[PDB]
Amino acid sequence: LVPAWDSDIIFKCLCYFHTLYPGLIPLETFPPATIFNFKQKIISILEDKKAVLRGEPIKGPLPICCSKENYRRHLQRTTLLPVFMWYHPTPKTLSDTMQTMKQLAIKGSVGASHWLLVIVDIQARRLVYFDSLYNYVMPPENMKKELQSFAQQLDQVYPAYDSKKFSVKIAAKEVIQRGSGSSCGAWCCQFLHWYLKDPLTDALNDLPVDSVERHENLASFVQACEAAVQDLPELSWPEA
Ligand SMILES: [Cl-]
Numbered sequence: 001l002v003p004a005w006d007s008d009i010i011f012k013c014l015c016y017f018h019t020l021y022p023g024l025i026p027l028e029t030f031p032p033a034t035i036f037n038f039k040q041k042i043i044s045i046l047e048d049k050k051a052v053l054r055g056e057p058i059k060g061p062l063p064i065c066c067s068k069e070n071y072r073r074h075l076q077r078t079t080l081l082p083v084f085m086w087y088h089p090t091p092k093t094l095s096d097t098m099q100t101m102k103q104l105a106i107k108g109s110v111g112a113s114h115w116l117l118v119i120v121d122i123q124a125r126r127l128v129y130f131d132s133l134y135n136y137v138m139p140p141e142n143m144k145k146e147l148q149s150f151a152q153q154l155d156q157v158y159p160a161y162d163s164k165k166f167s168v169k170i171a172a173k174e175v176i177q178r179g180s181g182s183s184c185g186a187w188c189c190q191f192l193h194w195y196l197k198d199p200l201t202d203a204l205n206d207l208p209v210d211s212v213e214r215h216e217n218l219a220s221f222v223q224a225c226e227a228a229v230q231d232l233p234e235l236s237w238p239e240a
Helices: 007-020 038-053 068-077 094-106 140-157 184-197 211-228
Strands: 080-087 114-121 126-130 167-170
Touching: 007 080, 007 184, 007 211, 038 068, 038 080, 038 114, 038 140, 080 094, 080 184, 114 184, 126 140, 126 184, 140 167, 184 211
Parallel strands: 126 167
Antiparallel strands: 080 114, 114 126
């Protein structure tokens, strides 16, 4: 009784978050990033930011629902990439992950599929990894090491003025989404909103223990989001 946010409603919620926090670029979720290509996707966005900062053309392709001029403006302004990752345990490649996702979508079934969020905070030079199921993909200390290596590539790809290094944070210390099959999308957008309000958010440590109470507060958050996006344009990037 707090249902599944698909890629559509996650996208709209991100558009809405942009209008509150312009630094956030509302990256599309169709087709989404995966465990296999999220690094390439991020690198490619930051190379496009660098290009735009130099008045150069961009490479990486246009988002489907965004004009070229508007995308450039977003890339210029953005200080935060919300990368939504669609995962399933069975597929072993990008090609198979894509094929699996298309199969469950064309059946409208859920499966063992799951949303993760990686936040690239460019201002703070911080990678934040949020898994509402704690270790659905791999243990957190292993994700940490994998992301620290990634963080060193980003130091080369997107240097700071003073060689300040990208740091890594694993957000969830425990399973957050307790006894719920479907709430992973919503949790991702809740955590993102907390982070936009306060990048040093302790909101995950401050949760109620009671799983039901927790999911009621989330149901609140979800209704407030659904109200705010009701009138907002469909399949259409906000103008930066
Ligand atoms: Cl932006």
